[PDB]
Amino acid sequence: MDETVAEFIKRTILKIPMNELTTILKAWDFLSENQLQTVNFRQRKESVVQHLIHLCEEKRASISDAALLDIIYMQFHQHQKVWEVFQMSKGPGEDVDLFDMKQFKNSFKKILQRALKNVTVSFRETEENAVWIRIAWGTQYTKPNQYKPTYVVYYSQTPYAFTSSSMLRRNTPLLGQALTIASKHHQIVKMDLRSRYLDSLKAIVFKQYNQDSRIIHENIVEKERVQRITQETFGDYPQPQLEFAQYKLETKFKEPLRCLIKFSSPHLLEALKSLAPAGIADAPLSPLLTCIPNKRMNYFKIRDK
């Protein structure tokens, strides 16, 4: 029920698919149980995106909760808008005895509006104990832009704070700065982990993923070996990186020979696992390629050694 708010809600309501209309509209709380029956969710897309936004016209929707709608949309569509991983680092001392979600919301919004005075920061403390910050940016010269927001999934007391790599503007060093000063840390470092599957980045940065008689195969002693070495490097249930696992090679050919390798698969760490047994790869499959989760890194910048 406002400029860049009502039509913003319209643009985020045609984004959400028809199946999970109830799921996202129930969680953002503006449509109570009585309001759900008024609109027939099963009829049409333009019908619902017109009646629902009217149901907020009577509900006088504001950007503070319109952005929360976008948050809840992305919580089920986090597998888009490839995510950078920021890693905080406190120095020597005790941990953050005060991460009050109210205090963190204050210490983040205050620092962000200290310089980026026109931003619509909207938090959503999820049930997995990970505040799902969404930031619509805009300098003092412009209104906060909700067209391209920068969602930041900060796990509540974790040194790691995922970030939607939207545009990587001059706010990115302020995104990390506000993040590391709201949560009582000192150094913000981009881990350089950049994947589209946040549910896999969560696994990686937390190490949370692993916790006939006639056909005489003459190279059976080699197939057994290659299967063995592909089970002590890729143990069980690898997580889908699905990311351009770059290897910006700077090595001499055996002065350097610059390369910018980009492994690109819908499911990378499983694609590598089925390489050596398929004959494409050697059995010891180059730890540069096996230690993507073990190093918690895929955007490599290797050199010679």
């Binding site: 090595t251 180059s286 730890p287 540069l288 290797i302 050199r303 010679d304 050694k305």
Partner: peptide, 5 residues
């Protein structure tokens, strides 16, 4: 080393 073999 940085296993560049």
């Amino acid at each position: 080393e940085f296993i560049i073999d």
